[PDB]
From a paper:
One of the most attractive TBV targets is Pfs25, a glycophosphotidylinositol-linked protein expressed on the surface of ookinetes, which develop from the fertilized zygote. Pfs25 is important for ookinete survival in the protease-rich mosquito midgut, and Pfs25 assists in the invasion of the midgut epithelium and maturation of the oocyst.
Sixteen amino acid exchanges separate 2544 from its inferred germline precursor (gl2544). Five mutations (G55S and D100GY in the heavy chain and T91A, P94T, and F95P in the light chain) appeared to be the most critical reversion mutations for Pfs25 binding. Only two of these residues, G55 in the heavy chain and P94 in the light chain directly interact with Pfs25.
Numbering used by the authors:
A (entry chain D): 1 to 217
B (entry chain C): 1 to 228
The structure:
Amino acid sequence: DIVMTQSPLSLPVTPGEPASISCRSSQSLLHNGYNYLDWYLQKPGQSPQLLIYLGSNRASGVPDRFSGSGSGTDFTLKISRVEAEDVGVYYCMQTLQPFTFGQGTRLEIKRTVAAPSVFIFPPSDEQLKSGTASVVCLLNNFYPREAKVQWKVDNALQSGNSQESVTEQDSKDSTYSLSSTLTLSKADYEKHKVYACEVTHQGLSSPVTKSFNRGEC
Amino acid sequence: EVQLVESGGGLVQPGGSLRLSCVASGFTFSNYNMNWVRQAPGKGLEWLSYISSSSGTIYYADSVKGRFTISRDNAKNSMYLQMNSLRAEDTAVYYCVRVEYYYGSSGYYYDFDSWGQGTLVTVSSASTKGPSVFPLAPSSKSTSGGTAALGCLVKDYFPEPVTVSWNSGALTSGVHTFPAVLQSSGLYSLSSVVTVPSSSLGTQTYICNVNHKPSNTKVDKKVEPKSC
């Protein structure tokens, strides 16, 4: 199939300021003066809606802020003035060989940098009785999404034994939240002493570390 | 109003088969081209197949070509997607989409103007299993000025989804329920945390309500504060 490439994948925009999204095609979509490329927007919890058709034509009821341009293999969706209701994933869709969506660009609210409040939860005694241990690192209400969580046990760099999960941008605070769960067997958990997750973010002066000692509490 | 309703989703193992159905209401289904579109967890929309009103024109994406079959019955206002040779990457929500074809002043164009709520298809060898709910107790490690952090660990369940609430829906501010992760065991796991005033740890009892309909499992676990 024809390959669609969008950039970037996440686009923080300050409300009231312009924004543009690029869409690249593996082959030319121009044919008899028409560019067979459409732009869709999927708002949070809503169905996708038609924004632009045939490259540069606004669908019925689409505000003047939205505009499309480009030709052949390079196309651009531009928003002259970004409103708060424009957040969501923007897709470009090729219609020369129906159909192919792009990866999608998530338009997100740009705000002031925030500091993640880091917490850590030892494995519950109910879980230890089942032969497994899970330690949960929690990064609450930070910005931007970029954050590095490294699990250190006895000052040793763990790898391939943790999983990460990030929430959607909050509707009111426009912030994110991250969860890191370190899963270990009870035997491996009862063989080490100090457990900690090292958080790295731009909202922090230096890598903040939260730790706990096995057995306590 | 236009209403598309997908059904037939559920569980299947790699190499297996399952048939999806979409019923259309609120419009003359026989005069409309239709689409199947899916969206895998944490991925963008992917078009799958197209069928004209008369079934005389059918398109397939290369990712599903030879494995999926689209068809429709205009008398029953319905459309189908026969899925064979299913793979783990076919795990997605499958959407029924109406394809409107306007012929305006600026040129002819499609409009995917109606999407159903979708049906979930999971392709895996794992068996249906209820989750184990473990507490994330407030303790010395939960440090904040006047507030505490507590949550629940919903671990080792299959398939998606689960619903999590706190105090049967009373506690809604500060609640964060994270998207589930797929563990190497084939089971899902997520955590749901909430930040509440630390001066209410003794006052208010906080219970997380975990419901897993596929396994008929319902767990209410109270998060006891740690006095350390």
